[PDB]
Scaffold this active site. Structure first.
Site, PDB file in Angstrom:
ATOM      1  N   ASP A  35      -6.056   9.188  -3.221  1.00  0.00           N
ATOM      2  CA  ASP A  35      -5.610   8.604  -1.977  1.00  0.00           C
ATOM      3  C   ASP A  35      -7.064   8.562  -1.484  1.00  0.00           C
ATOM      4  O   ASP A  35      -7.698   9.515  -0.744  1.00  0.00           O
ATOM      5  CB  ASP A  35      -4.880   9.629  -1.257  1.00  0.00           C
ATOM      6  CG  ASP A  35      -4.729   9.246   0.184  1.00  0.00           C
ATOM      7  OD1 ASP A  35      -5.036   8.114   0.581  1.00  0.00           O
ATOM      8  OD2 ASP A  35      -4.042  10.084   1.006  1.00  0.00           O
ATOM      9  N   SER A 199     -13.609  -6.324   8.492  1.00  0.00           N
ATOM     10  CA  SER A 199     -13.425  -7.428   7.727  1.00  0.00           C
ATOM     11  C   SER A 199     -13.621  -8.585   8.884  1.00  0.00           C
ATOM     12  O   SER A 199     -13.582  -8.278  10.088  1.00  0.00           O
ATOM     13  CB  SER A 199     -11.878  -7.709   7.533  1.00  0.00           C
ATOM     14  OG  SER A 199     -11.219  -8.827   7.220  1.00  0.00           O
TER      15      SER A 199
END
Length: 330
Positions: A35, A199
């Site tokens: 994770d 992004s």
């Protein structure tokens, strides 16, 4: 040193991925959910409340000659989905794919929430976010990666998740045969303890690319792609019959649909998520309403590039002095 381990979807929907991990001496192999959005290595154990164990493999520290109770240490974690776990702490030897760390904090669960109990395939989590998020008290502990880092050939790990197929986690090297083209690296902020990056935009299907900054986290421990409501609405508007359902808890779509791809930007580069990766199947057995793999982050408070996004890429988690993230197509 290096390590390399195969990671395997837990079910036909890729709801999560498990990776075998050797703990203790002699080795006890548990299948953990790696994770990159959390920083605790915790396991089902011989200390876990009996009614809360349902098919998981447990770690029994009394059977490990290298286990040592970390005196006075406790831990307690709550995840974004409302699941939780807590317990006490041992140090022991932990190996992943041939890479060994001695003295790793292994957090033994005394209590786990129902969602963990119900997932028989997941024996615990291995956190790979920054150690500043680790919940052990009163002395915070380091992640497996943080402990291994100085010994690694290069201070990196990579995630290469498969779509309906096994993939690989590598530690300490970049497998140049595992991706196509070049790896594009992008800046990371560690301010919130995550692999947080920005992004450069998105496209839906064959549509034009929208240049827009989207701050979010690269999180292997989250199944879906959670993005701003504007972006998600633009995606689902291209699917006839798709709608946001408050009763179901997100966007659903007719199972008869063909889903468009979704592209996200990494600097000037582009990662394309095929439409099929966005299908999470019937909302309930036999239903013709299917759950979407792109969902709104509104009310989460952060955008999350979870497995839906990451499995479309070869992803480098660069733990150099100034961390960065790399993405390549594959």
């Amino acid at each position: 040193s290096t390590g390399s381990a195969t990671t395997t979807p837990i079910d036909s929907l890729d709801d999560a991925y498990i990776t075998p991990v050797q703990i203790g001496t002699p080795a006890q192999t548990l299948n953990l959910d790696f994770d990159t959005g959390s920083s605790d290595l915790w396991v089902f154990s011989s200390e876990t409340t009996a009614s809360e164990v349902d098919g998981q493999t447990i770690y029994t520290p009394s059977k490990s000659t290298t286990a040592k109770l970390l005196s006075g240490a406790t831990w307690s974690i709550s995840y974004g989905d409302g699941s939780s776990s807590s317990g006490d702490v041992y140090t022991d030897t932990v190996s992943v794919g041939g890479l060994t760390v001695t003295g790793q904090a292994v957090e033994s669960a005394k209590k786990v929430s129902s969602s963990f109990t119900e997932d028989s395939t997941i024996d615990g989590l291995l956190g790979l976010a920054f150690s500043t998020l680790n919940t052990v008290s009163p002395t915070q502990q380091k992640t497996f990666f943080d402990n291994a880092k100085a010994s690694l050939d290069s201070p990196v790990f990579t995630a290469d998740l498969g779509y309906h197929a096994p993939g690989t986690y590598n530690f300490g090297f970049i497998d140049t045969t595992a991706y196509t083209g070049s790896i594009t690296y992008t800046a990371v902020s560690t301010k919130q303890g995550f692999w947080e990056w920005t992004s450069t935009g998105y496209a839906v299907g064959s549509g034009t690319f929208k240049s827009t900054s989207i701050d979010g986290i690269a999180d292997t421990g989250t199944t879906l792609l959670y993005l701003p409501a504007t972006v998600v609405s633009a995606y689902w508007a291209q699917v006839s019959g798709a709608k946001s359902s408050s009763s179901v808890g997100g966007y659903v779509f007719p199972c008869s649909a063909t889903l468009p791809s979704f592209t996200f930007g990494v600097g000037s580069a582009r990662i394309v998520i095929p439409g099929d990766y966005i299908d999470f199947g019937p909302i309930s057995t036999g239903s013709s309403s299917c759950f979407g793999g792109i969902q709104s982050s509104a009310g989460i408070g952060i955008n999350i590039f979870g497995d839906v996004a990451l499995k479309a890429a070869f992803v480098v988690f660069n733990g150099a002095t100034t961390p960065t993230l790399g993405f390549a197509s594959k």
